[model samples]
Target: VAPNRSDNAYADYVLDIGKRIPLSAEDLGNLYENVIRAVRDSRSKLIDQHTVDMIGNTILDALSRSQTFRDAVSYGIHNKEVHIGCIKYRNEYELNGESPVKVDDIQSLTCTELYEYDVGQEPILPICEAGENDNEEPYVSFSVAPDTDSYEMPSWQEGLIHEIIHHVTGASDPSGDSNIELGPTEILARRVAQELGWTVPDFIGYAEPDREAHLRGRNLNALRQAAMRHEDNERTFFERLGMISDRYEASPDFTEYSAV
Candidate 1:
């Protein structure tokens, strides 16, 4: 196929046979690994060659038909590349709680502080585990269920792009809050993804409302008031919020300040 060899053996085998298939080296490698893991997890015993081949061929067929795959491959092959340490998938419960109720279609995040500085460092955060510092290197993860009626599951490419936006922006939710909900960062991420030619759904736009609610809950009245202020003010909502944030940082009780 392509001159680039996949670090994954199974992916290399698929590439050797599917030379005409026009997927990126990274895409093929991830597909191979995902298929192998899916098959292995579904079956208790060691997988056989026949099973592996079947799964690979099936996934290949799906990729061939997938618009998601085509778009993602195009971006990965042609776009400005970023350093992604790894991409791993986890079920919703494994990511958070054991509740049976489904949350959203999918949720993803990146380590905030790490991305703000060394954008190329290896992400140190684990997929489902907790961490100590807020300024460490960023790692990325996607939390999703096998099925959800709220929306269609994102393809691997869409998920990666969304998470990468978090890294690029170095954005996270305010302290003690989860970024999984709609927020300014989530909206910005989706907007960037859309600009990159990804078909981001209109529903994610709801993050604006989520952000408004978040700001209200934090008692950020200055920012809320500035949202409706005219050009005469000469200060944006974010500018006002930044000033407030600065004031909080100057105080000893800043640790208790919830509005970030």
Candidate 2:
């Protein structure tokens, strides 16, 4: 694990500020405690930013780099050719609320599943929940259900992508009735998803003349707006976290791992 104690000034300032919070610890304490917890809790006892990143990267990398995901794209293209006898492009549709629905139009999409396990029952949820500024974790609950045909494919993928982004970025769901902006996490996730074959219609501002396209466009806009809110709030939160890490690195008592 690499050590980084050079940025102590900022860390000290943040730590001083953090001292005012009721349940909050000094910067070094929070960072060290969390790092120790993470390491002790990990299957392997490695403790460092690289190690921490490795755990998160393991999951993200697996899904992002899977051969199965790539293979699905080729299979989808081949199937499209077989069904149509030739590939064809058509005009985008607008919502009239009344339009003919075609099988091929629907087949262009894919389905995936997302299940929300209760946060209170999940160990990981509590670890995160207890670390919140207000001593209350924003509900990990999803307002929208994922079982419908609407969430079967790209939407499901988008949902998972969104949650994962939150986990990494230090952003939380709003408490009460407040609006938040997208943070670095959401921006990265959205960009990654678009690159990985997920369609974000609003990002491209595509105009649709068909009903399906209109619905999709609307959904994309909503996702974008919410993501933007989360991102804005995340910047300050993550910056605080970075300061905490910096302080921990400079601490005379900092240890890579507690004695086992």
Candidate 3:
């Protein structure tokens, strides 16, 4: 989908807000409305509102289960270490703290370099698609500079979380011989970002009111059927997923994925 003027406008608005919070109830409501608008507009061409909402709600549900968001919020409020990586960064203050001991450091670090180095150093595993067992294990590899630089607004925490989800879900291109599509996964990731109070620029292209209505009608029946299956199985969604079933899945290589 192509983004238009409305998407650009909303994206700018969200970016302007940054991390400042404590908004009034009315303000929060308006922000939610904007989110709806953005999602609908982006999905207008392919999905109806019902389908978008069904998938969108799944996204929200996933975020509600996110350890990353929970830990960040808890630590952000209490001023404690959210993770080992957070602890190390706070203690060392080496990455974003004072200037490096030598002047050469300033000239050597480009935005992309810094982003890759910062995110790569985090404690999460990175896996790329490679193997023939059709079930071969995904190979671990870190994100390189170009991949991290493709984003308009980048954050190390989110980048790590995104990769982690891919590793866990077996979303690699070569895994299952299934080429990963940009539909549900992207929607889920954007929802996670929303939970973290960050804006996903691509989402603004979605969120049109008409599209929202259409997705709702289309996905409603399928969602009800899925719900019944969930009820019958009595399995928490994640438990149903078989996280390491084959270990053959590989993560999508950012370099190749970005080109598409």
Instruction: Give the worst 10-residue stretch by lDDT in candidate 1.
Output: 87-96
Tens-digit per-residue lDDT, 107-216, candidate 1: 22122221232212222211321111255534343221112212222322334344543333233333333334444334443544454444544443323555434322
| Tens-place lDDT digits, model 3, residues 35-120 | 35543442322112332343334333333554333332233223321211111000000123332322232222232332233222
Each prediction's number of clashing residue pairs: 0, 25, 26
For candidate 2, the 10 contiguous residues with the lowest summed lDDT are 82-91
Encode model 2's per-residue lDDT on 1-260: one tens digit a residue.
32121221222222233233323235324434443444334322111333234333323342445332222222322322111111111111112223222222211211110012121211111011112224432212111122222433344344444443343233333333222323333334455556666564343211223423433443433323322333433433222223332322221222312242
Best-matching candidate per TM-score = 1
- The CA root-mean-square deviation of candidate 1, after full C-alpha superposition on the true structure, stands at 19.8
Instruction: Please identify model 3 stretches exceeding 4 Å from their true place.
Output: 1-140, 144-156, 172-181, 203-260
Candidate models: Cα lDDT each: 0.32, 0.29, 0.29
RMSD of each: 19.8, 23.3, 23.0
Give the number of colliding residue pairs in candidate 2: 25
Off by more than 4 A, model 1: 1-82, 86-138, 145-151, 154-160, 174-184, 196-198, 201-260
Top-lDDT candidate index: 1
Clashes of 1: 0
